Design a protein around this ligand. Structure first.
Ligand code: HEC
Length: 90
């Protein structure tokens, strides 16, 4: 999908906690492929990330009220793309 929009959305909303694909609230739950396979409900799939973005999880807020449907799909695919290619620079 729109990967340029995904970065804009990730950069303006998610980076407060996932700077560099890291996790400042919970160090272990990072945005790396292996963290995702291990800690994200549903595993490493775009769908699992979308679900977690819209409904939140614990200290992670829900985004359904703040982002649009297309923004959620974009950010999810962007995060997916980053983990696959292991492109997170921290
Ligand atoms: C800080 C207050 C956060 C913001 C802003 C966003 N996320 Fe987050 N995320 C945060 C926590 C503490 C956690 C784990 C919560 C738990 O109880 O398990 C997460 C987790 C994720 C994950 C899964 C990570 C993993 O299991 O290894 C994803 C895929 C995720 N977060 C994505 C993400 C995106 C795209 C955001 C912007 C829309 C976003 N998070 C904001 C804390 C915070």
């Amino acid at each position: 999908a729109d990967l340029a929009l995904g970065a804009q959305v990730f950069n303006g909303n998610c980076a407060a906690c996932h700077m560099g694909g890291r996790n400042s609230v919970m160090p272990e739950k990072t945005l790396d492929k292996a963290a995702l396979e291990q800690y994200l409900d549903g595993g490493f799939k775009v769908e699992s990330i979308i679900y977690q973005v819209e409904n939140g999880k614990g200290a992670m807020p829900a985004w359904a009220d703040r982002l649009s449907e297309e923004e959620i799909q974009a950010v999810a695919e962007y995060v997916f793309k980053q983990a696959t290619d292991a492109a997170w620079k921290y």
